[PDB]
């Protein structure tokens, strides 16, 4: 017989939950049956205990069972996401969002899950004239006609509203901050997944491993929830139900070391102008980081029909990402995406 | 600017708060400005980080500042409390309440802070079944104290601004640092006490808060988990005197008490527990009496600490003798009757 006092007691006692308990909690939360105080207690207690991959899998799984799906057979088998936990506290430019446009322009289907923020990916896309607010059918059409779509989290996860409000009221990051990347309603099988929390990246990787995804979970060793250019990054490579953790250094591909301030963003307008600069061919630290993350996504996608080995896949990813920019394909794709939105 | 994200982030990092942060959080909670989610996040985060005496002192001090006080010059200088955190999970007979009556009958003024269970039957519930009026305001508690030798401050009467916290406590069910606040926020501010703690890891923090106040207190945890001095085994006692704490292991066998079993101290509903009080005050021998005598002696020892630093073993011997005499002279049974009579005179 599950209950709040039982589950919360177990977590405050610093014990892992029994199987099913996390799912019960999340389902109470998703059906509107949990009091705000219970939601907050659970989010915090799970965080301070240190969630396991099995527990987070229950959370994300239950949350997905309440999401609006995309229609049958509208998401290609090899679609990729580019998305992070956020909360790295460094207010960067929208690296994942820029990378996603570049990856799509390179010919890889992209279905990005995202949200508002502090200009978040959704805010920046909105400021660029992209329609962020589309329902399942129109997202699937975006994907078919433009090669990219965007699932706005509030539109696809209406039942999460009680949790979202508690997250706003308490402000502190929790286990819930992990769920965004794990509950893309289109369920792409590949992804470049950023984690700001060094010790939870491994947990996120474990969740993806139990899905058969081909994913790179990445954490900049400077704290970025992206592949960084200022130093090394830790990568948890996920494929075939297993994890291969490694240290990644972009100097090995000839990237100059950048400073973190050179990647700082601003409001929606500033971050939109940064997008247009990069897609127009402006060289510099921001382009470098976009190219780096776009290549990472391309590598994860390569992991699905896994011909290539790691190094050759990276070399191919970097070349495709750079060419997608330099040939104007990325600029053109964004314009195409905006036109699509404007056609009703 | 203190804020929830700043304070909760600190706690979730496993760091002690900066000075004043716990006080800010408690101000928010006591003014109705903290959302239920913020209250619960804070209660839980403070519990899992492991609260310090300074943090809990801030919570308790702000809480006391919002409480109704007794009127000026109505609490004796040497009043004592006998109270625990509850939450030992054992559902015993009301040991603290029985001890309080015996202690007052031995001539030590008692002002008890308490509440309902709100089960099977808390101190407040049992007193009510005995015909004691638990629901009295400051002026009448003061009068009871002067006329009978004992008073009872009903927590919801004296701490109305705590209602947001109390509702959250009930919603989450799980024990938190807030479970420590009852014993630390007696609105009469007695300076001595026998204080039970059901959570062994937190008894030392409670002690530290009493030490910062220069109270004479024994904070006790039965090694069987009871928030009282037990007779089923040894107890841990943090003795607070002269603004300092030292930890002791206490064995009642050394005063000639036989070992009892938990079930010999098991409670029932308010009526059953009332009958247990009446049996003990009537002079019935057995394990409930033994437990009451022991806890009464402890409060008497704490009270003696106000004006002494007398030797431990003699202090206990006299405490136990005074508690036994209070029952066996009829004084305790008589005191309860005087207390019941006082409440009936109010109309
Ligand atoms: O319901 P629980 O969490 O187990 O708590 C049981 C009782 O212990 C505390 O009181 P106190 O020590 O004043 O009363 P008692 O020892 O006489 O019952 C609390 O206020 C309850 O009255
Ligand atoms: N971080 C996220 C990533 C994707 C998403 F859809 C939502 C969030 C979020 O935190 O609100
Ligand atoms: N329902 C939601 C789902 C995801 C999210 F990030 C926010 C909301 C919200 O209601 O604010
Ligand atoms: N106000 C209160 C003060 C103390 C307490 F224990 C409970 C309440 C309550 O409202 O239930
Ligand atoms: N346990 C307690 C001891 C004294 C008090 F005033 C309140 C409580 C309580 O938690 O309701
Ligand atoms: Mg990102
Ligand atoms: Mg980021
Ligand atoms: Mg008690
Ligand atoms: Mg007790």
XYZ file of C-alpha atoms and ligand atoms in Angstrom:
761
model
C 0.000 0.000 0.000
C 1.860 3.081 -1.258
C 1.486 6.441 0.448
C 3.196 9.745 0.768
C 4.319 9.151 4.333
C 5.790 5.762 3.358
C 7.622 6.958 0.238
C 8.800 10.269 1.752
C 9.949 8.438 4.891
C 12.011 6.051 2.809
C 13.692 8.943 0.921
C 14.433 10.997 4.077
C 15.900 7.810 5.508
C 18.218 7.902 2.473
C 17.029 4.626 0.966
C 16.315 3.869 -2.664
C 12.600 3.343 -3.310
C 11.066 -0.084 -3.967
C 10.150 -0.724 -7.596
C 6.828 0.928 -8.492
C 7.011 3.599 -5.753
C 8.412 6.372 -7.946
C 5.823 5.528 -10.605
C 3.015 5.706 -8.012
C 4.244 9.111 -6.866
C 4.520 10.437 -10.374
C 1.092 9.162 -11.316
C -0.443 10.918 -8.242
C 1.331 14.075 -9.435
C 0.182 13.717 -13.044
C -3.489 13.023 -12.175
C -3.797 16.124 -9.996
C -4.064 14.010 -6.822
C -0.938 15.214 -5.073
C -1.025 18.307 -2.861
C 1.568 20.983 -3.736
C 3.295 20.234 -0.415
C 3.543 16.539 -1.345
C 4.960 17.296 -4.794
C 7.629 19.578 -3.314
C 8.552 17.129 -0.553
C 8.963 14.381 -3.065
C 10.996 16.474 -5.553
C 13.397 17.618 -2.827
C 13.700 14.293 -0.981
C 14.394 12.408 -4.238
C 17.029 15.007 -5.093
C 18.849 14.849 -1.745
C 18.688 11.060 -1.624
C 20.215 10.901 -5.185
C 17.855 9.324 -7.687
C 18.734 6.065 -9.387
C 18.256 5.378 -13.104
C 15.432 2.925 -12.266
C 13.580 5.652 -10.296
C 14.040 8.350 -12.971
C 12.879 5.854 -15.588
C 9.649 5.411 -13.622
C 9.176 9.181 -13.415
C 9.780 9.762 -17.089
C 7.810 6.697 -18.138
C 4.725 7.749 -16.190
C 5.029 11.296 -17.493
C 5.230 10.004 -21.069
C 2.084 7.894 -20.545
C 0.141 11.161 -20.001
C 1.695 13.058 -22.910
C 0.058 13.755 -26.248
C 1.775 11.550 -28.803
C 2.525 12.493 -32.416
C 0.343 10.571 -34.911
C 1.350 7.006 -35.859
C 4.201 6.802 -38.400
C 5.040 10.527 -38.551
C 8.371 10.377 -36.722
C 11.194 8.827 -38.719
C 13.058 5.973 -37.040
C 16.261 8.031 -37.083
C 15.021 11.374 -35.688
C 17.303 13.099 -33.191
C 16.830 15.524 -30.296
C 19.243 18.172 -29.108
C 18.261 19.257 -25.597
C 19.583 19.825 -22.093
C 18.547 19.947 -18.454
C 19.441 23.646 -18.431
C 20.374 25.206 -15.087
C 24.123 25.449 -15.710
C 23.816 28.995 -14.312
C 26.008 30.547 -17.004
C 23.239 32.063 -19.192
C 24.707 30.917 -22.533
C 23.439 31.584 -25.988
C 20.984 28.858 -27.202
C 23.569 26.299 -28.289
C 21.240 23.318 -28.488
C 18.647 25.201 -30.525
C 21.264 26.451 -33.023
C 22.810 23.004 -33.264
C 19.357 21.500 -33.973
C 18.833 23.835 -36.961
C 22.324 22.953 -38.223
C 21.749 19.213 -37.798
C 18.434 19.407 -39.695
C 20.093 21.404 -42.472
C 22.688 18.633 -42.716
C 19.800 16.304 -43.634
C 19.107 14.618 -40.258
C 15.502 14.654 -39.010
C 15.204 16.674 -35.808
C 12.404 16.778 -33.323
C 13.278 19.054 -30.488
C 11.516 19.120 -27.157
C 11.743 22.445 -25.415
C 10.338 25.196 -23.306
C 10.578 28.857 -22.310
C 13.248 29.973 -19.835
C 16.934 34.341 -19.489
C 15.927 33.515 -23.064
C 15.195 29.813 -23.475
C 15.212 27.846 -26.718
C 11.463 28.377 -27.224
C 11.784 32.125 -26.537
C 14.559 32.489 -29.075
C 12.718 30.471 -31.729
C 9.665 32.604 -31.136
C 11.758 35.766 -31.534
C 13.003 34.332 -34.875
C 9.401 33.940 -36.126
C 9.220 30.176 -35.696
C 5.860 28.888 -34.476
C 6.541 27.160 -31.172
C 2.922 26.395 -30.256
C 1.917 23.664 -32.720
C -0.107 20.563 -31.917
C 0.810 16.954 -32.721
C -0.471 17.026 -36.329
C 1.289 20.225 -37.316
C 4.553 19.184 -35.627
C 4.454 16.041 -37.739
C 3.889 18.176 -40.874
C 6.780 20.464 -39.870
C 8.974 17.398 -39.583
C 7.826 15.995 -42.986
C 7.976 19.315 -44.866
C 10.868 21.200 -43.211
C 12.890 18.347 -41.676
C 12.551 19.768 -38.173
C 9.797 20.141 -35.619
C 9.455 21.556 -32.144
C 7.355 20.120 -29.340
C 6.541 22.878 -26.863
C 6.419 21.138 -23.468
C 3.251 22.815 -22.069
C 1.313 21.949 -25.228
C 2.307 18.252 -25.101
C 2.379 17.668 -21.321
C -0.734 19.403 -19.937
C -0.982 17.056 -16.942
C 2.457 18.173 -15.705
C 1.005 21.597 -14.829
C 0.851 20.856 -11.071
C 4.527 19.848 -11.027
C 5.610 22.813 -13.202
C 3.967 25.219 -10.763
C 5.700 23.623 -7.780
C 9.037 23.841 -9.636
C 8.481 27.580 -10.168
C 7.477 28.145 -6.519
C 10.523 26.435 -5.009
C 13.043 27.496 -7.693
C 15.761 25.093 -6.526
C 16.770 22.477 -9.133
C 15.471 18.937 -8.447
C 15.179 15.524 -10.038
C 12.354 17.089 -12.111
C 14.902 19.138 -14.064
C 16.094 15.804 -15.548
C 12.734 14.946 -17.119
C 12.606 17.438 -20.020
C 15.216 15.577 -22.101
C 13.674 12.246 -21.112
C 10.077 12.981 -22.118
C 10.214 14.283 -25.673
C 6.702 13.318 -26.765
C 7.905 12.303 -30.256
C 10.201 9.734 -28.593
C 13.173 10.120 -30.904
C 15.659 7.258 -30.564
C 18.782 9.393 -30.869
C 19.967 12.508 -29.130
C 22.589 14.861 -27.867
C 21.491 15.335 -24.285
C 23.058 17.999 -22.038
C 23.222 17.619 -18.227
C 24.375 20.464 -15.963
C 24.616 18.150 -12.969
C 27.795 16.089 -13.186
C 26.627 13.215 -10.967
C 23.184 12.905 -12.639
C 24.429 12.603 -16.206
C 25.234 8.988 -15.502
C 21.721 8.457 -14.218
C 20.258 10.041 -17.390
C 22.496 7.792 -19.488
C 21.168 4.729 -17.613
C 17.578 5.741 -18.430
C 18.466 6.053 -22.140
C 20.321 2.728 -22.065
C 17.116 0.974 -21.001
C 15.412 2.431 -24.098
C 17.805 1.198 -26.769
C 18.487 4.799 -27.775
C 21.678 6.012 -29.402
C 22.479 9.014 -27.244
C 25.438 11.131 -26.129
C 24.810 12.482 -22.659
C 27.252 15.313 -22.228
C 28.530 17.519 -19.455
C 31.122 20.235 -20.026
C 33.856 19.948 -17.413
C 33.200 23.703 -16.961
C 29.590 22.989 -15.919
C 27.899 23.515 -19.313
C 24.886 21.355 -20.215
C 26.431 21.242 -23.746
C 29.676 20.113 -25.306
C 31.987 22.965 -24.397
C 34.897 24.628 -26.143
C 36.559 26.072 -22.992
C 37.889 22.721 -21.746
C 37.157 18.982 -21.905
C 33.733 17.380 -21.540
C 32.541 14.120 -20.068
C 30.489 12.028 -22.458
C 28.357 9.062 -21.550
C 27.948 7.305 -24.839
C 24.792 5.155 -24.932
C 24.069 2.433 -27.474
C 22.757 -1.147 -27.624
C 21.611 -1.028 -23.985
C 25.050 -0.072 -22.644
C 27.141 2.950 -21.591
C 30.760 3.921 -22.488
C 31.959 6.880 -20.401
C 34.830 8.936 -21.743
C 36.683 12.224 -21.625
C 36.312 14.269 -24.809
C 38.726 17.035 -25.847
C 37.825 19.261 -28.842
C 41.492 20.373 -29.200
C 41.854 16.931 -30.785
C 39.759 18.262 -33.688
C 41.651 21.523 -33.722
C 39.225 23.705 -31.816
C 40.884 26.591 -30.025
C 40.083 26.839 -26.335
C 37.441 29.520 -25.727
C 36.506 31.464 -22.599
C 33.042 30.972 -21.111
C 32.068 34.685 -21.301
C 32.375 34.488 -25.110
C 29.300 32.173 -25.099
C 27.085 34.329 -22.830
C 23.627 35.198 -24.161
C 21.100 37.952 -23.475
C 17.365 38.446 -23.986
C 15.307 36.785 -26.737
C 16.334 39.496 -29.255
C 20.024 39.225 -28.447
C 19.963 35.428 -28.672
C 18.002 35.613 -31.919
C 20.645 37.946 -33.390
C 23.327 35.474 -32.258
C 21.441 32.758 -34.196
C 21.278 34.870 -37.361
C 24.990 35.768 -37.086
C 26.048 32.128 -36.822
C 23.819 30.947 -39.647
C 25.125 33.759 -41.838
C 28.697 32.453 -41.514
C 30.202 34.621 -38.748
C 33.304 32.803 -37.474
C 34.145 32.777 -33.780
C 33.663 30.999 -30.446
C 29.875 30.688 -30.760
C 30.021 29.092 -34.200
C 32.682 26.714 -32.914
C 30.426 25.568 -30.071
C 27.405 25.224 -32.374
C 29.427 23.156 -34.865
C 30.760 21.015 -32.030
C 27.310 20.264 -30.631
C 25.759 19.727 -34.080
C 28.480 17.186 -34.848
C 27.758 15.447 -31.541
C 24.125 15.075 -32.544
C 25.130 13.787 -35.939
C 27.343 11.199 -34.202
C 24.469 10.029 -32.009
C 22.283 9.707 -35.105
C 25.082 7.674 -36.779
C 24.903 5.351 -33.759
C 21.451 4.121 -34.913
C 22.510 2.527 -38.221
C 25.908 2.129 -36.608
C 28.360 1.808 -39.433
C 30.983 4.274 -38.276
C 33.456 4.120 -35.476
C 33.785 6.974 -33.023
C 36.595 9.063 -34.579
C 35.509 8.830 -38.207
C 31.911 9.610 -37.093
C 33.128 12.786 -35.355
C 35.169 13.851 -38.372
C 32.169 13.308 -40.629
C 29.838 15.102 -38.172
C 32.079 18.187 -37.976
C 32.400 18.389 -41.773
C 28.605 18.055 -42.288
C 27.866 20.605 -39.560
C 30.320 23.152 -40.968
C 29.122 22.607 -44.528
C 25.488 22.980 -43.457
C 26.402 26.479 -42.273
C 28.892 27.509 -44.972
C 26.661 26.446 -47.873
C 23.785 28.504 -46.466
C 21.699 25.340 -45.912
C 21.090 26.207 -42.230
C 20.092 29.820 -42.954
C 17.805 28.561 -45.703
C 16.217 25.893 -43.504
C 15.348 28.412 -40.776
C 13.771 30.695 -43.391
C 11.842 27.691 -44.685
C 10.731 26.860 -41.136
C 9.474 30.389 -40.567
C 7.572 30.331 -43.921
C 5.997 27.011 -42.942
C 4.645 28.595 -39.737
C 3.228 31.545 -41.648
C 1.317 29.279 -44.087
C -1.594 28.872 -41.539
C 18.166 39.283 -0.518
C 17.314 35.994 1.136
C 15.132 33.907 -1.174
C 13.704 30.403 -1.451
C 15.975 29.376 -4.339
C 19.028 30.611 -2.470
C 18.120 28.930 0.848
C 16.833 25.648 -0.645
C 19.822 25.428 -3.040
C 22.148 25.769 -0.072
C 20.381 22.982 1.794
C 20.210 20.684 -1.221
C 24.005 21.244 -1.555
C 24.284 19.845 1.972
C 25.498 23.123 3.438
C 24.585 24.753 6.724
C 22.708 27.993 6.155
C 24.184 31.466 6.693
C 23.114 33.124 9.946
C 19.635 34.658 9.578
C 18.488 32.457 6.675
C 16.468 30.041 8.832
C 15.003 33.097 10.577
C 13.920 34.588 7.214
C 12.299 31.299 6.185
C 10.407 31.070 9.468
C 9.233 34.735 9.166
C 7.805 33.868 5.728
C 6.086 30.758 7.130
C 4.617 32.501 10.196
C 3.312 35.505 8.182
C 1.381 33.377 5.655
C 3.793 34.390 2.883
C 5.330 30.974 2.247
C 3.467 28.789 -0.255
C 2.723 25.224 0.916
C 5.372 23.947 -1.598
C 7.979 26.304 -0.144
C 7.166 25.275 3.401
C 7.440 21.562 2.545
C 10.610 21.952 0.482
C 12.207 23.783 3.421
C 11.045 21.306 6.085
C 12.356 18.386 4.060
C 15.591 20.016 2.925
C 16.507 21.065 6.487
C 15.838 17.517 7.696
C 18.014 15.774 5.097
C 20.903 18.246 5.405
C 20.814 17.797 9.228
C 19.786 20.885 11.137
C 22.142 22.710 13.501
C 21.329 24.158 16.926
C 21.764 27.653 15.539
C 19.319 27.009 12.687
C 16.709 25.462 14.980
C 17.235 28.336 17.471
C 16.333 30.741 14.682
C 13.195 28.782 13.768
C 12.103 28.566 17.408
C 12.884 32.200 18.263
C 10.878 33.549 15.352
C 8.013 31.168 16.223
C 8.023 32.367 19.861
C 7.920 36.003 18.706
C 4.531 35.280 17.067
C 3.102 33.340 20.046
C 0.689 34.711 22.643
C 2.674 35.089 25.860
C 1.394 34.579 29.389
C 0.804 37.857 31.248
C 3.789 39.579 32.890
C 4.976 38.059 36.234
C 2.689 35.009 36.166
C 5.116 32.168 35.380
C 7.281 31.233 38.333
C 10.998 31.693 37.854
C 11.516 27.971 38.399
C 8.725 26.443 36.282
C 9.349 23.212 34.418
C 8.003 21.515 31.298
C 7.638 17.796 30.736
C 7.132 17.153 27.045
C 8.450 15.242 24.051
C 8.531 15.401 20.285
C 6.222 12.389 20.117
C 6.599 10.236 17.012
C 8.225 7.249 18.760
C 5.637 5.052 16.988
C 4.930 2.977 20.095
C 1.577 4.420 21.265
C 2.277 4.419 24.983
C 0.277 5.559 27.900
C 0.754 9.333 28.433
C 3.963 9.200 30.425
C 4.887 12.879 30.179
C 1.403 13.955 31.261
C 1.331 11.641 34.279
C 4.809 12.743 35.255
C 3.764 16.386 34.926
C 0.948 15.872 37.441
C 3.270 14.125 39.939
C 5.976 16.760 39.504
C 3.484 19.559 40.202
C 2.195 17.601 43.195
C 5.767 17.422 44.510
C 5.737 21.252 44.644
C 7.462 22.102 41.337
C 5.406 24.410 39.166
C 4.675 22.880 35.803
C 3.520 24.628 32.698
C 2.968 22.041 30.053
C 2.945 22.739 26.352
C 1.045 20.216 24.380
C -1.272 19.140 21.693
C -3.664 16.432 20.544
C -2.291 13.222 18.939
C -3.997 14.638 16.868
C -4.598 8.883 17.387
C -4.540 7.058 19.595
C -4.601 9.573 22.475
C -2.162 12.440 23.076
C -1.617 14.286 26.331
C -4.219 16.873 25.474
C -6.810 14.207 24.593
C -6.272 12.289 27.851
C -6.484 15.454 29.965
C -9.742 16.230 28.240
C -11.108 12.731 29.027
C -10.081 13.328 32.656
C -12.185 16.492 32.626
C -9.358 19.001 32.475
C -10.005 22.069 30.275
C -7.138 22.188 27.784
C -8.465 25.133 25.769
C -7.612 28.103 28.018
C -6.142 31.464 27.111
C -3.077 33.128 28.716
C -4.872 34.742 31.677
C -6.512 31.470 32.714
C -3.357 29.358 32.251
C -1.589 31.860 34.511
C -4.419 31.583 37.050
C -4.330 27.786 36.894
C -0.590 27.887 37.490
C -1.015 30.162 40.531
C -3.983 28.308 42.011
C -3.421 24.644 41.145
C 0.396 24.480 40.568
C 0.096 23.413 36.929
C -1.137 24.853 33.633
C -1.524 23.628 30.093
C -0.831 25.767 27.010
C -2.784 24.302 24.060
C -0.522 24.740 21.052
C -3.180 25.856 18.524
C -4.473 28.424 21.051
C -0.989 29.976 21.603
C 0.574 29.619 18.148
C -2.200 30.546 15.727
C 0.220 31.799 13.048
C 1.792 28.287 12.837
C -1.339 26.959 11.121
C 0.250 27.048 7.630
C 3.185 24.992 8.834
C 0.940 22.565 10.766
C -1.259 21.901 7.691
C 1.826 21.129 5.616
C 3.175 18.798 8.339
C -0.070 16.821 8.141
C -0.049 16.796 4.355
C 3.419 15.254 4.062
C 3.157 13.034 7.130
C 6.907 12.465 7.331
C 8.824 13.675 10.435
C 10.931 16.795 9.881
C 12.878 19.378 11.825
C 9.476 20.951 12.539
C 8.737 18.033 14.879
C 11.361 19.545 17.206
C 9.586 22.882 17.595
C 6.860 21.978 20.152
C 9.201 21.427 23.111
C 11.220 24.516 22.070
C 8.269 26.938 21.814
C 6.408 26.608 25.096
C 4.793 30.042 25.307
C 5.367 30.212 29.054
C 9.170 29.908 28.546
C 9.892 27.695 31.518
C 13.637 27.564 32.139
C 13.783 23.907 33.038
C 12.461 20.783 31.452
C 12.482 17.072 30.877
C 12.342 16.876 27.086
C 11.887 13.580 25.232
C 13.166 13.142 21.705
C 12.075 10.211 19.519
C 14.822 10.930 16.943
C 18.205 9.965 18.353
C 20.142 12.009 15.766
C 18.316 15.246 16.707
C 18.335 15.070 20.507
C 21.747 16.748 20.555
C 20.502 19.641 18.434
C 17.551 20.177 20.833
C 20.034 20.178 23.697
C 22.160 22.809 21.970
C 19.175 25.102 21.594
C 18.409 24.756 25.325
C 22.108 25.370 26.080
C 22.117 28.623 24.072
C 19.206 29.645 26.322
C 20.937 28.612 29.566
C 18.013 26.356 30.437
C 18.359 23.496 32.909
C 17.142 20.579 30.863
C 17.492 16.848 30.427
C 16.900 15.853 26.834
C 16.143 12.149 26.790
C 15.855 9.287 24.332
C 15.118 5.740 25.499
C 17.476 3.316 23.742
C 14.297 1.394 22.848
C 13.188 4.460 20.804
C 10.860 6.064 23.395
C 10.663 9.873 23.645
C 10.740 9.372 27.436
C 12.986 7.850 30.052
C 12.237 4.163 29.606
C 12.203 1.202 31.977
C 12.688 -1.422 29.237
C 16.391 -0.609 28.830
C 18.991 2.181 29.025
C 18.395 5.775 27.939
C 20.585 8.428 26.406
C 20.497 11.749 28.248
C 21.936 15.030 27.070
C 22.204 17.009 30.264
C 22.049 20.781 29.738
C 23.340 23.015 32.523
C 25.536 26.126 32.720
C 25.047 26.668 28.968
C 26.796 23.352 28.173
C 25.789 19.830 27.133
C 27.224 16.441 28.037
C 25.945 13.086 26.862
C 25.256 10.279 29.387
C 23.968 6.718 29.294
C 21.348 6.192 31.968
C 20.409 2.841 33.514
C 17.399 2.743 35.855
C 18.443 -0.740 37.061
C 20.953 1.207 39.175
C 18.038 2.610 41.262
C 16.432 -0.794 41.608
C 13.946 -0.686 38.712
C 13.223 -4.058 37.099
C 13.285 -4.234 33.310
C 9.847 -3.928 31.796
C 8.541 -4.830 28.327
C 7.169 -2.254 25.891
C 3.717 -3.803 25.802
C 3.391 -3.211 29.577
C 3.362 0.555 28.732
C 0.995 0.330 25.707
C -1.803 2.905 25.484
C -5.347 2.862 24.124
C -8.004 5.482 23.422
C -8.513 8.624 25.540
C -10.762 6.746 27.985
C -8.314 3.882 28.526
C -5.444 6.299 29.023
C -7.550 8.340 31.446
C -8.150 5.159 33.449
C -4.371 4.525 33.433
C -3.732 7.987 34.894
C -6.341 7.364 37.604
C -4.791 3.962 38.409
C -1.286 5.409 38.845
C -2.381 8.398 40.927
C -4.412 6.035 43.119
C -1.206 4.253 44.078
C -1.328 1.182 41.778
C 2.019 -0.513 41.608
C 3.576 -1.884 38.447
C 5.432 -0.786 35.327
C 3.345 2.303 34.498
C 3.981 3.749 37.971
C 7.674 2.886 37.649
C 7.895 4.761 34.345
C 5.966 7.786 35.719
C 8.174 7.976 38.821
C 11.314 7.836 36.709
C 10.221 10.605 34.365
C 8.910 12.744 37.231
C 12.297 12.346 39.016
C 14.062 13.470 35.805
C 12.020 16.689 35.671
C 12.704 17.232 39.340
C 16.447 16.763 38.692
C 16.267 19.290 35.843
C 14.440 21.744 38.123
C 17.111 21.317 40.846
C 19.710 22.193 38.204
C 18.227 25.698 38.048
C 19.686 26.644 41.428
C 22.376 24.002 42.206
C 24.607 21.731 40.166
C 24.044 19.153 42.953
C 25.516 15.713 42.463
C 23.831 13.521 39.889
C 23.129 10.352 41.913
C 21.832 12.139 45.026
C 19.733 14.458 42.833
C 18.102 11.394 41.267
C 17.567 9.657 44.618
C 15.727 12.660 46.036
C 13.845 13.142 42.776
C 12.605 9.567 42.877
C 11.680 9.818 46.556
C 9.760 13.085 45.995
C 7.892 11.556 43.055
C 6.946 8.469 45.079
C 5.826 10.490 48.062
C 3.749 12.753 45.805
C 1.742 9.715 44.705
C 1.678 7.870 48.033
C 0.602 10.854 50.178
C -2.397 11.294 47.874
C -0.953 14.630 46.735
C -0.947 13.771 42.981
C -4.497 12.381 42.923
C -5.551 15.480 44.884
C -3.767 17.817 42.477
C -5.563 16.392 39.471
C -8.891 16.845 41.302
C -7.953 20.468 42.127
C -7.058 20.987 38.466
C -10.400 19.569 37.312
C -12.211 21.718 39.891
C -10.407 24.884 38.716
C -11.595 24.325 35.139
C -15.177 23.755 36.343
C -15.110 27.104 38.213
C -14.476 29.098 35.070
C -18.164 29.016 34.173
O 1.085 11.229 18.534
P 2.581 11.135 18.753
O 3.414 11.830 17.699
O 3.114 9.769 19.125
O 2.807 11.978 20.107
C 2.312 11.462 21.347
C 2.271 12.560 22.406
O 3.613 12.918 22.773
C 3.692 14.346 22.771
O 3.153 14.805 23.991
P 3.672 14.701 25.492
O 5.061 14.145 25.628
O 3.363 16.058 26.032
O 2.483 13.754 26.022
P 2.506 12.295 26.679
O 3.921 11.810 26.834
O 1.892 12.536 28.029
O 1.603 11.500 25.753
C 2.717 14.835 21.706
O 2.292 16.212 21.856
C 1.578 13.851 21.936
O 0.679 14.327 22.955
N 14.849 21.597 -19.453
C 13.876 21.269 -20.300
C 14.129 20.612 -21.490
C 13.066 20.305 -22.320
C 11.780 20.654 -21.955
F 10.878 20.391 -22.677
C 11.519 21.301 -20.766
C 12.579 21.612 -19.935
C 12.324 22.277 -18.750
O 13.160 22.242 -17.820
O 11.259 22.925 -18.631
N 2.259 21.833 -18.320
C 3.572 22.079 -18.422
C 4.394 21.109 -18.966
C 5.752 21.333 -19.086
C 6.287 22.539 -18.664
F 7.596 22.708 -18.800
C 5.477 23.540 -18.129
C 4.093 23.323 -18.004
C 3.287 24.331 -17.453
O 2.048 24.154 -17.274
O 3.800 25.419 -17.107
N -2.000 26.503 14.719
C -1.418 25.408 15.186
C -0.377 25.526 16.109
C 0.233 24.391 16.619
C -0.204 23.145 16.182
F 0.351 22.121 16.630
C -1.241 23.012 15.261
C -1.875 24.145 14.747
C -2.907 23.971 13.819
O -3.421 24.965 13.259
O -3.301 22.814 13.513
N 4.798 17.323 20.081
C 4.434 18.541 20.496
C 4.826 18.992 21.753
C 4.441 20.263 22.184
C 3.660 21.067 21.348
F 3.299 22.202 21.693
C 3.267 20.626 20.099
C 3.644 19.364 19.659
C 3.199 19.023 18.388
O 4.003 18.584 17.540
O 2.000 19.216 18.080
Mg 20.775 23.243 -24.408
Mg 22.579 25.041 -22.265
Mg 5.746 12.441 26.200
Mg 5.954 9.471 24.540
